[PDB]
Write a protein that binds this ligand. Structure first.
Ligand SMILES: CCCC(=O)C(=O)O
Ligand SMILES: CCCC(=O)C(=O)O
Ligand SMILES: [Ca+2]
Ligand SMILES: [Ca+2]
Lengths: 329, 330
């Protein structure tokens, strides 16, 4: 007889986003199915029991046993957490999964989460993000000066160096903030989530690419001690379920964003590519931010150099095995 | 008490093909771990209990309960099985997973396997394959006329329409055949597997891309009646373990191929892009082959048109959300 385990999972997400909230639900449903009801986890939307941006805090305190969040929400505690979500001009979703599972990423991220009493598992990806929504159209790089924009992580810091006034909001809050006039622009994920949250209603000017988040990972987090007290069978169920959340969510976003792109263009939204004045300035600002973080911390520097090497090698591989068919019509 | 289930899994793979055999091992180990030993599956290498090309036949007959194979080994039984692995100029591994899980592909493939008493689950990908190994560099499309090349499946049929003299050889045999002068060229999967077979020693010209296999799926198969007999808990364990095999294998190949590519370029291998004359002729010959299959069968035609639509839409999406960052090299 294995125990009846009953857990709660705090998430960073609103229930309306069945893509990303769906990853948390998948983990909870699958351990219940595999355990025949002996191992249950109740998922909660952002703000129900824990604020969306404080999932790691609640997991560390053990006010919940586990969570579903984005590591880059905690760059204030350790800028190295950025690599476990996405960094500007960083890894594709497929490269990010390769880096986590076989390039040393999951070991690097678990070493950081160990400092906050937690263990981490990849448990979602949005795939490549788009460039966000603007109430007024962008004319050139100088159009960004003084804009109030919702955008998190090191992407936010890059946009701040370009003169954007970066605002902190969980996904659920963006539409009201855009309507009330609190902000002038926002990015979230892509067509499917952006349209569902009402971003295409609040703003008409959509850009690409989302160079800040080329393949952002969502992590399942478990309290170290809660994880220790789990029998080996239930650890295996949870760990395996997170692979389904990770591959299942990426595939779900690819499908839903592909349909939503067609829907919003038919409904009147025009998608524009960012000018090279913005892309060049973003790349340069990103290099400056990573240089500063590296000079301030040998651990960050060492991780940045291992990740940069992984990135160079995997891009060289994908330039041969994938890019030629992607660009040939 | 849930039952003590003991199954056997027939695989299409030698144990030396370890990244792919590893997918089968992952499923077997993970259901044993999650069930605390109550659900065990014993994996077998190709030939040990069932020939590698007869996994589906063995699963249908229930001589084994489950299998790990490539749907495109069964195109002689139904050419529609091709889409469940890879087709020339088809889907990237990421697009292939999107198509299977959400685009209707798993439902299409399960309707085909239902004819043979089987249910199917995605359970691996090699990722994009390369264009194979050539002793002498290719000058142009006419250089392929009469060239003796190891290349199997629909890829071989396309290369045949380009005038290639298609040679059938096992993985293990290609090195000797290249050295002996028996064949002029050969493809397998990519740098990791190809280096282990000695192909970097036998030839200096490695072509790309492998337009015949842009993201080949490996499928777990279960006998429909064996699956029916399985408690709901063990079904969930098996189905979930196949997601780990699928994402795990692709990521493992990406890592191994990226490392092996660096080793073989240091060993003086030249990476050559196929000329547009070959890529245009191959795309056209592939479209002719799929046209003939479609004209001979309304069910094939319908599936080809659903897949072509999914492919157009996903490519349109990836041209926006991925290609811009992928094509700028620093
Ligand atoms: C990582 C998914 C959520 C996100 O991209 C964001 O909060 O912007
Ligand atoms: C998917 C493995 C089979 C193959 O690609 C080959 O033998 O060439
Ligand atoms: Ca975002
Ligand atoms: Ca091959």
């Amino acid at each position: 007889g294995l125990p009846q385990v009953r857990w709660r999972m705090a998430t960073s997400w609103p229930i309306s986003l069945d893509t990303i909230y769906g990853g948390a639900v998948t983990i909870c449903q699958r351990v219940e199915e595999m355990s025949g009801g002996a191992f249950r986890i109740e998922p909660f939307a952002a703000g129900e029991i824990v604020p969306g941006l404080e999932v790691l805090d609640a997991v560390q305190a053990r006010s919940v046993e586990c969570g579903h969040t984005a590591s880059y929400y905690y760059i204030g505690k350790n800028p190295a957490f950025a690599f476990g979500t996405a960094v500007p001009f960083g890894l594709s979703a497929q490269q990010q999964n390769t880096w986590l599972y076989y390039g040393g990423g999951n070991e690097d991220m678990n070493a950081l989460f160990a400092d906050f009493g937690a263990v981490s598992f990849p448990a979602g990806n949005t795939g490549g993000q788009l460039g966000g929504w603007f109430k007024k159209p962008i004319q050139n790089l100088a159009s960004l000066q003084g804009l109030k924009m919702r955008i998190p992580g090191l992407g936010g810091k890059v946009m701040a160096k370009l003169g954007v006034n970066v605002q902190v909001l969980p996904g659920g809050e963006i539409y009201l903030a855009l309507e009330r006039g609190t902000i002038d622009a926002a990015e979230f994920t892509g067509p499917y989530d952006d349209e569902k949250l009402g971003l295409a209603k609040a703003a008409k000017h959509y850009y690409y690419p989302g160079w800040w988040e080329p393949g952002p990972t969502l992590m399942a987090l478990v309290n170290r001690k809660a994880w220790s007290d789990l029998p080996k069978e239930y650890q295996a169920m949870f760990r395996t379920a997170c692979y389904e959340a990770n591959l299942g969510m990426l595939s779900n976003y690819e499908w839903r964003n592909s349909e939503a792109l067609q829907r919003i263009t038919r409904q009147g939204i025009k998608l524009e590519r960012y000018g090279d004045d913005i892309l060049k300035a973003a790349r340069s600002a990103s290099a400056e931010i990573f240089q500063e973080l590296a000079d301030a911390d040998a651990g960050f520097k060492a991780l940045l150099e291992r990740w940069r090497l992984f990135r160079r090698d995997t891009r060289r591989w994908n330039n041969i095995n994938e890019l030629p068919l992607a660009e040939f019509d």
